[PDB]
């Protein structure tokens, strides 16, 4: 009965973690931020509408400059746009048209994409020949590739449907590190501001914090009732927010090792597809299956506002590095810039 | 007003726009089929007939009509994580082996392969993403089914069966039991073929069913339907 004995020891350890989490929870976040003023009402208008994609848009990522963004659609095309002038800087045809994620390198020299082909393709933008070439194809995942984020020009972290994350060295195309522990499909990831740690949310209603160098899971966070579609970090790096299929967003804290806040409203039952924060972290923006986006006071859990401009599911959204604008991309083949 | 480099960037953007519109038109004129079915149900035989990790894609052109066919059998993840990507396909080609009507599943004890294929067909046909999408159903291995139907009756799978143990009656019963799983009779049509291995009569059936689907789509576009 060695298996059963380790199951009892595991249950005892889970009870110990639960008791240690309840020990360090004297008050809630709502009890402390009950005296600060509300942010009011946030009215954001559609400044720009990026048109050109002919199928559903599955992902978008902003560049560090905050004037260039990359969008991916199922028509087989990564488009790199100029937000200020609505000009198409680049159009990259994909070998596989089943794309689910895209990333923009912090240097701006590369983009990445991936999807149902189980391959992360890295495309070089700054080429002497004047076109965009496939610089690398990273294969080794046995499930669909759901998210990818650049650490630098040579390292990339991908999440996949094979319940594993992976850190790749780009110039040799090899999995430098493999992150295992999730029992369901990892649907999203997010990198910290120092890129020492990253969090990943999976279809097992759990989010895991991973060290990038030592390749281990530091903390596990539960609380969601269903699949965690989206995850994003608070700007200090000491907290993250998860968007799930149970129509709630949740704010977890790495140092308190538990859930701090729940963002949910009885009128909204649709699941969250994408989450992001503002530059100060006071606003939390979440895209929903009800064709809209909701802006929540991240310290008071009130609905600060609604971004309602899409005719289909808001599949992805992002906030610029200076926080000047929010881009929402949706299944109605449009991206919209809100300010 | 714009500078010279801004004007040339706008001109490059409009060239990109025209290339996008041309690629969109050529993509729109193609036929996309999603291939589904149980493991070892004759899907490979169908792929070999049409042809002459990740998502397998098959390119073939019949009677001046181009067909892409997507096999997604290598995805071990749960279906609802990626099935919404195939919402706009022309048709779903569903392969069912008839010879599995008496063979128990090897993964799960006391569960039949035919019941599992009917539950998969019920999950796909009534999925919220495929309300208007049509299904081309291929019943594979009809000669092995005719050999087995002489010794093993259909009553081991369908206890409510009231017909004989002959080939054609049992085949018609299995066809009716697959076509009555369609809840949305009005919005979609189900086309059934017995995968005869003679004179390439399966590619012609796919062509005919896709032509019927394109006719119904044009009737919906013109407002008549």
């Amino acid at each position, epitope marked *: 009965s060695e298996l059963d004995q380790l199951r009892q020891e595991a249950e005892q350890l889970k009870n110990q973690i639960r008791d240690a989490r309840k020990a360090c929870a004297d008050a809630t976040l709502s009890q402390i931020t009950n005296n600060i003023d509300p942010v009011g009402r946030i009215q954001m208008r559609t400044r720009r509408t990026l048109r050109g994609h002919l199928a559903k848009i599955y992902a978008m990522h902003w560049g560090t400059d905050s*004037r*260039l963004l990359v969008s991916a659609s199922q028509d087989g095309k990564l488009i790199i746009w*100029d937000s200020y*002038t609505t*000009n198409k*800087v*680049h159009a990259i045809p994909l070998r596989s048209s089943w794309v689910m994620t895209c990333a923009y390198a912090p240097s*701006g020299n590369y983009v990445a994409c991936g999807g149902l082909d189980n391959i992360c393709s890295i495309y070089n933008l*700054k080429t*002497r*020949e*004047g*076109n965009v070439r496939v610089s690398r194809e990273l294969a080794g995942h046995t499930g669909y590739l759901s998210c990818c984020r650049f650490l630098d020009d040579n390292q990339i972290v991908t999440s996949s449907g094979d319940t594993t994350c992976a850190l790749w060295d780009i110039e040799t195309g090899q999995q430098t590190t493999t992150f295992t522990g999730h029992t369901g499909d990892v649907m999203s990831l997010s990198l910290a501001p120092d890129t020492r740690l990253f969090v990943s949310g999976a279809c097992d209603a759990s989010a895991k914090l991973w060290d990038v160098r030592e390749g281990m899971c530091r903390q596990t966070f539960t609380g969601h009732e269903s699949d965690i579609n989206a995850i994003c970090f608070f700007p200090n790096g000491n907290a993250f927010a998860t968007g799930s299929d149970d129509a709630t967003c949740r704010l977890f804290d790495l140092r308190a090792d538990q859930e701090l806040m729940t963002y949910s409203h009885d009128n909204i039952i649709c699941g969250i597809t994408s989450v992001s924060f503002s530059k100060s972290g006071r606003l939390l923006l979440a895209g929903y299956d009800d064709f809209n986006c909701n802006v929540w006071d991240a310290l008071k859990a009130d609905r600060a506002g609604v971004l309602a401009g899409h005719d289909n599911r808001v599949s992805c959204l992002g906030v610029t590095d200076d926080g000047m604008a929010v881009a929402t991309g949706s299944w109605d083949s449009f991206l919209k810039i809100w300010n | 007003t714009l*500078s*010279a*480099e*801004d*004007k*040339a*960037a706008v*001109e*490059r953007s409009k*060239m990109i726009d025209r290339n996008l519109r041309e690629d969109g038109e050529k993509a729109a004129r193609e036929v996309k089929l999603l291939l589904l079915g149980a493991g070892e149900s004759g899907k490979n035989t169908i792929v070999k007939q049409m042809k002459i990790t990740g998502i397998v894609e098959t390119h073939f052109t019949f009677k001046d009509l181009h067909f892409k066919m997507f096999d997604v059998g290598a995805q071990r993840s749960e279906r609802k994580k990626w099935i919404h990507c195939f919402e706009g396909v022309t048709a779903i080609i569903f392969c069912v082996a008839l010879s599995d009507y008496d063979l128990v599943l090897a993964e799960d004890e006391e569960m039949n392969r035919m019941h599992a294929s009917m539950k998969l067909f019920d999950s796909i046909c009534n999925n919220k993403w495929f309300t208007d999408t049509s299904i081309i159903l291929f019943l594979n291995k009809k000669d092995l089914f005719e050999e087995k139907i002489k010794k093993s009756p259909l009553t081991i799978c369908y206890p409510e069966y009231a017909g004989s143990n002959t080939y054609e009656e049992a085949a018609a019963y299995i066809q009716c039991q697959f076509e009555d799983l369609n809840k949305r009779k009005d919005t979609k049509e189900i086309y059934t073929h017995f995968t005869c291995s003679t004179d390439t009569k399966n590619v012609q059936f796919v062509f005919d069913a896709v032509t019927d689907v394109i006719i119904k789509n044009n009737l919906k576009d013109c407002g008549l339907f």
Partner: single-chain antibody
Amino acid sequence: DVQLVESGGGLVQPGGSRKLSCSASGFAFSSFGMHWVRQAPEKGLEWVAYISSGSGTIYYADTVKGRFTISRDDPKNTLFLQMTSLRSEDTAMYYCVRSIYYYGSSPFDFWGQGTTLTVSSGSDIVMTQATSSVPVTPGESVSISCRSSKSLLHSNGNTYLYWFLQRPGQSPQLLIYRMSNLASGVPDRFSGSGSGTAFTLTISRLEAEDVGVYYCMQHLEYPLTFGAGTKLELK
């Protein structure tokens, strides 16, 4: 590698006709706009003509207007300049220059080797490079000044001035694009600092391959105009 080869030069009787060709290899030719730029032997560079990518936009200089015709054939990767009714002033070395235009791109980045054409016998921006020659020694910082008659700073925040270096016996090479941005393959010791109408190009720790003639070009408005060039020589 990227390569532009010109042909069609030689000696032409005055009033005649000739057709220059520029064959491109090693880059996506149909995504680059192309320029013809002439260089009379004693004088400096002078912009002649421009055809956009996709041939939707064509510009000429006033001197060559009505006489010259620029064209491109994209499947054969070839650029043509049909020159009719040639004059004595037309005698020059001709370069095809590639230039691509998007956000953050570097136009005028590659120049062809040039073909020699020998003919026997008002609102344009004026760029001024006041000092024609500067004597310098290696290892010493040096500043080259350009001055524009019109403000080159646009309302979008971009300042459109380019710095080129022509080594002796070679084609011009792009050094600085859009006032401050440095070009690919250019060493970091070059630096461009300008304030609307006055521009400076600084070469810290000068080396033996930095001698030659330095040209400033505006790209705010067509026609594109060059400076007279500032020459650096050793000793």
